[PDB]
């Protein structure tokens, strides 16, 4: 994530500031920083603003500009042409970009919105079923990082302190059984509830950096403001409120609603098991630890060796602490290359088959097949352009293209209206 933080200016900048001291008349310039601070922590020439950007955020800007292509665009300094393409594909997968690369109205909302496009999707979809406070609390948590101090780093694994560690960790799981960042969410506003004086006592029981904790309160107060500015036509008039900062438990239905808004945030950063897509290709059994269970990203390309595509779950991840058969489709914030034997995965939550299709529907990554014929699979056709039909949806790479490796979803009733010769899904029937 990109954030605006007070940081040392360039030396050349500092010289310009001293310059104005003299232009009207020769005078001394004072500097609060010491000279040997100045030599160390300053850059002689300010590093270009363009480099300071997220590249995807640059791509979003030109799309507001309506520029046809970045490679077409003339620039002083190059971002990688391929990396620029990945952002375009990423925006398409998020849904900001149509297959014609023209910026969608959902996309145009983001060029207005400051933060990066991926974090923007969560916030455009956040305002659903009064779940807006939760997503911002999630997003603020994601930006700050992991507050949990793992038992291995603590060195407690003393044994009683493991039990206290486990109990705080059991306390964390109550909001969602299989979800780590919903669980991380469960801590963000849990500390909002506990009083100010008992914060330092709350953190020590939970081993949380209270300095890290308090930021999510400020970020939440900020992020909530920017979102409320954008949602409401009276952008400035909206005010941040402590009561709105306070929020209630997401209902059990809302928990699934949270799962979808996360998947909207990270549509690409998703992985199915290895075995589900290739049953019997690699031996899998319950006795194997959840770390030993392999997963494959859809965005990951098909590889000569399956194990390279295989990615595994983090032991610090909660799902391994459960010790149950994992859920079939997993969603991850990031894949940690650490571990030669196994690539680590931290997962926000389990993502279900049918709900995943909806985010896939929102994105351009999804591919539809032709209608299938079978008992009860007949299709109604009101007008030449529209039918209701059962279509097997294939996420990411199709069966035809072997370059990438996607999983196929089960067929579902859907309404399709012809547009330019193929019939656009109007709603999941």
């Amino acid at each position: 994530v990109q954030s605006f933080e007070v940081g040392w200016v360039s030396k050349a900048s500092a010289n310009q500031r001293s310059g104005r001291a003299g232009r009207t008349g020769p005078g001394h310039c004072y500097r609060l920083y010491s000279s040997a601070v100045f030599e160390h922590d300053f850059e002689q020439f300010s590093k270009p603003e363009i480099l300071r950007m997220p590249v995807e955020s640059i791509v979003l800007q030109m799309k507001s500009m309506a520029i046809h292509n970045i490679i077409n665009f003339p620039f002083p300094t190059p971002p990688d042409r391929v990396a620029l393409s990945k952002a375009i594909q990423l925006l398409q997968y998020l849904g900001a970009l149509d297959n014609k690369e023209m910026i969608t109205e959902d996309g145009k909302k983001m060029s207005l919105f400051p933060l990066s496009p991926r974090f923007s999707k969560m916030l455009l979809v956040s305002d659903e079923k009064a779940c807006l406070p939760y997503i911002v609390a999630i997003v603020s948590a994601l930006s700050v990082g992991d507050p949990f101090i793992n038992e291995f780093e603590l060195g407690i694994n003393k044994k009683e302190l493991r039990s206290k560690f486990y109990k705080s960790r059991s306390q964390f799981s109550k909001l969602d059984k299989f979800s780590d960042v919903f669980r991380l969410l469960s801590v963000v506003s849990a500390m909002d509830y506990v009083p100010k004086e008992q914060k330092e006592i709350f953190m020590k029981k939970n081993f949380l950096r209270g300095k890290l904790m308090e930021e999510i309160v400020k970020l939440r107060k900020q992020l909530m403001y920017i979102i409320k500015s954008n949602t409401s036509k009276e952008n400035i008039a909206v005010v941040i409120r402590n009561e709105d900062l306070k929020s209630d438990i997401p209902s059990v239905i809302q928990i699934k609603l949270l799962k979808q808004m996360i998947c909207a945030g990270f549509v690409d950063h998703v992985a199915v098991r290895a075995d589900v897509l290739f049953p019997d290709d690699a031996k899998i059994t319950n006795r194997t630890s959840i770390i030993n269970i392999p997963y494959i990203p859809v965005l990951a390309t098909r590889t000569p060796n399956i194990e390279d595509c295989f990615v595994y779950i983090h032991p610090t991840s909660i799902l391994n602490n459960l010790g149950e058969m994992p859920p079939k489709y997993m969603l991850y914030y990031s894949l940690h290359l650490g571990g030669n034997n196994k690539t680590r995965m931290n997962t926000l939550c389990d993502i279900a088959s049918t709900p995943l299709a909806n985010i896939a529907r929102k994105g351009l990554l999804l591919t539809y097949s032709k209608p299938l014929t079978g008992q009860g699979l007949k299709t109604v056709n009101l007008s030449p352009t529209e039918r209701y039909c059962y279509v097997v949806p294939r996420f990411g790479s199709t069966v035809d293209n072997d370059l990438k490796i996607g999983w196929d979803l089960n067929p579902i009733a859907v309404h399709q209206k012809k547009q330019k010769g193929q019939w656009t899904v109007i709603k999941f029937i």
Binding site: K174, V187, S189, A190, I249
Partner: peptide, 4 residues
Amino acid sequence: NPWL
């Protein structure tokens, strides 16, 4: 509270 429920979140504690």
